Symmetry: D2
Subunit: 319 residues, 4 copies
């Protein structure tokens, strides 16, 4: 019989209608009476309730680290791991854990719900039951995100709908599944001063200059189409000056789906000549958490630029 | 028989194998008799000199197109704007605010592949924009692409590349194709458009709100939630207390901010409901370019001016 | 306290383990079925259970009669049934329950209710919930999180959770005078598909006694060969009081009727096979004349067809 | 490169049909004379065929027109009415054994000349694909999709989205087989269907019966019906079980004890044409029943 560790970090799933309030042991009490969670074909599971519970819109890198450390501490003791989490930043946590759990060789499924588990026809019951069932019986040895009958690669996920049952999508990768080597290495991630900004017509040098002031170590630029920005020295000079002082400037597309394609370096692509590197088809969550992972280590800006473009954990498609 | 004005502003649609040759688009269409079908309207092409690569568009370029439509407004039955795909949704959004009391169709379109090339979407998009402007008039700024007519100020880039370039995530497409006009001077405006993320520091957000910034679009989580840390909320409140307009949009592909005791509201942040980034960025340009006070701008940003937002 | 729903367990995998009282025992220990937002329900298990692949029109009448018996004793009705012919039963009941003023929801599943991750658990729970809290006073069919109009449903995927569709009508939703229950008896009807070069000989065989009606599945908006060999057989059948109804062979759309009309064939508009087959049973069982039946087949009696 | 265009009939080359009006309309549409477009030659059938009046001799007429022109060209396009296009495509897939040049069938809702007509798009792409991206099978082109011919069925009764391939994703020397009309019953089982009515369906001259039964191929377990299917099979009638469902496969057993064989996931058009193909050749009932169950031309899946 398989055994799954369930980290209840926070989220509506384990709360009680009142609006929703946290109640200690509420999830343990409800699952004891729900016979499907004790079927012979279901794994054994153990709940660790975080004290205190985290509202996911308040999540910080320190919380990513706590979750990683909890998995690491329990790694040898279970067949797989389910993280319950609030929906607002679930994709950030999934993305960050993909980088932090190096040589992961058991399943980690992050999930949660729109509605508390105990409510009639809540997605909480289906999401938790499928996360347990899949980690035990159809293991994918990566950090996945389970929502609305789909298992996504965690570092490919973004919020689809601001709320409701179809909360998540993986715009640039097929779902891993429809529910119809080396030792685990965890390094310590810390908060990093990153700007995430969107280019728009006429964006000023003065504005951009200010986005790049200390303490900023990296900038994610969301640019047009396959990664184009204004051909204006006013913008390109501030981006080049930044990279010349060691800022990592990463190009993502504004588009819902698709890839930055800055072409060969020999094409003299204007952003590329200003020191900007391609983020290919990464999500904002994957690029933001990847920069946290790399800036948290002792790597040079050139080492980070190289690793930002390499597919480390299945987060990006390069050609 | 209807008459349509075509502003060829820029984009691949009018280019040849890809470089700009002046007069090329007009010469190519005269060879293509479907454009001269009895059920098609007459049209006149004004080729911009110089042509604009849409990744280089500025608000001055919005002004140029608005002024062109204004100059030609009484002389035609409708208007087609040919434009590069990269910022087409910015221009459609800006023209929706700029063309006040518009009462003729304005359809913006373009293509991946030049008109002349075999099986180009260029030929289909221009034929349908002309046809719809004359025969199926919606007297607003619309965007036509991939056999769909979108509300301009509801449009955003769907795929970075390819035929399925645009979507209106928060409004149904208008159409599957299977007072007098007022125009004020819009100018560039120092606006920050930033995304919140876990642990985002007060010092980074303080940088985004330095002078000369007049407004900040925040892309926040879910139905509009941000971290409850005084480090962030104190900086947003400092900015609103000195007249900066701080607008909350969701980082979600679809859906609406719902700010309702709300922490961001207490810090002076206003809801952008379900607006696109392109609608909110162009709407702040539209309002900041006028003489309006910060309080006026906060109220008008929340009002549905042109069909750009749903507030129920 | 709460609404009360009558659950007729007529047959189907949903209730199996073929063990009497099993469904009642299973549901007693499933707490979600006793939620405060759930209605009370009463289960009646048919003795014997019906395999839906052997359903006859007498089984249709048994279900209609059971609803009649219980009509004034409950707020709504859920019919559990085998998937193979669920759409025929839903179609037949829509005709037989004239002036229905309470919800009837037919459902079942691919997997027994008791199995982990079964659709039987989801289907029964939503049928109960919908019958009580979102009543539609018609015969509806619930499957794969969709409530369809019963006489609009047809089989979609041979198996799998997505086994029904309503190709000519939107879903009812996404989770006059009193009731007259009609009698339906078995009727000799042919249901056949036209193809290139189909001989007058083969169509004659379809129209032999004791056939009273023929459903033709024809091309696009209802086209048949302009060949006297075929139209002669059809006009001959119609002249001796056989009702010939034209359906399209397409997955969706309507017959738009003209040569077949001249051979006495009438339009089935956008009806499903299930609707047209059960509607002919309904009308033939009333001893109406061929002309009365041809008219009523073309009228929208229960929401089964769109006419312009 | 050079494509042969058999203009058999259909709304596409019409105005009502007008002798020669297609060829003269095309002369005035320069995209068809683009340098990246192959050369092509139109054969206007005399007389044109309303695809609803199509017969298997018309399938022969088309197969032979192809065979004759086979060496003269790089590929073939059949312009055809929409009503029975999938039947024609399925039939040619079986007849055109060892095919090594593209055959694409197409047509339209709207005559080629009309503004925003799908006729224009369909002919241009059928010519383009046959030259520039050859697939050596009988294919059907509609609503910007290239289907395997013997996997296609009528989707909507009209409209631009009229065809689907529900059980398959979009896409020796040539031996051309004969085909003739064959007496085949295509019937739908329903609750309580009488043994009398089924007995009548199976009377001479019927050589074969396609059943559209429930789900994965279930029929009533009543002797009335099984006896008549078994009696017809015992005297050499080929009874093929197809699902009534829009998609999916028969998986067979009561019907198999009565001699009925599985049509797997075939379309009605493929089973009905495969029976025409097999019955038109020198085969016993047992040989036909075996070949019906083997994937001959990409028409069926069996695990």
């Amino acid at each position: 019989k398989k055994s799954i560790y369930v980290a209840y970090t926070g989220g509506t799933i384990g709360m009680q209608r009142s609006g929703y309030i946290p109640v200690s042991g509420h999830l343990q009490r409800q699952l004891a009476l729900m016979p499907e969670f004790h079927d012979p074909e279901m794994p054994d599971f153990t709940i660790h309730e975080y004290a205190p519970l985290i509202d996911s819109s308040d999540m910080t890198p320190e919380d990513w680290q706590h979750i990683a450390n909890d998995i690491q501490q329990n790694y040898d003791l279970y067949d797989g791991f389910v993280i319950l989490h609030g929906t607002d930043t679930m994709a950030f946590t999934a993305s960050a854990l993909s980088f932090m759990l190096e040589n992961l060789a058991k399943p980690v499924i992050i999930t949660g719900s729109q509605i508390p588990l105990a409510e009639l026809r809540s997605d909480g019951q289906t999401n938790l039951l499928n996360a347990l069932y899949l980690a035990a019986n159809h293991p994918v040895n990566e950090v996945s995100l389970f929502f609305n009958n789909q298992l996504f690669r965690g570092n490919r996920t973004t919020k689809a709908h601001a709320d409701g049952f179809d909360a998540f999508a993986s715009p640039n990768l097929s779902v891993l599944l429809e529910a119809g080597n080396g030792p685990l290495i965890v390094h310590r991630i810390t908060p990093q001063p990153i700007g995430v900004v969107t280019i728009y017509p006429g964006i000023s040098g003065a504005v951009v200059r200010n986005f790049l002031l200390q303490p900023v170590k990296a900038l994610i630029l969301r640019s047009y189409g396959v990664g184009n920005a204004p051909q204006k020295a006013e913008l390109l000079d501030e981006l080049k000056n930044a990279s010349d002082r060691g800022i990592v400037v990463v190009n993502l597309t504004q588009s819902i789906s698709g890839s930055v394609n800055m072409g060969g370096y020999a094409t003299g692509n204007a952003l590329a000549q200003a020191g900007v590197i391609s983020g290919f088809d990464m999500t904002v969550e994957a690029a933001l958490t990847k920069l946290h992972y790399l800036l948290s280590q002792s790597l040079s800006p050139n080492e980070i630029r190289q690793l930002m473009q390499q597919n480390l954990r299945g987060e990006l498609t390069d050609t």
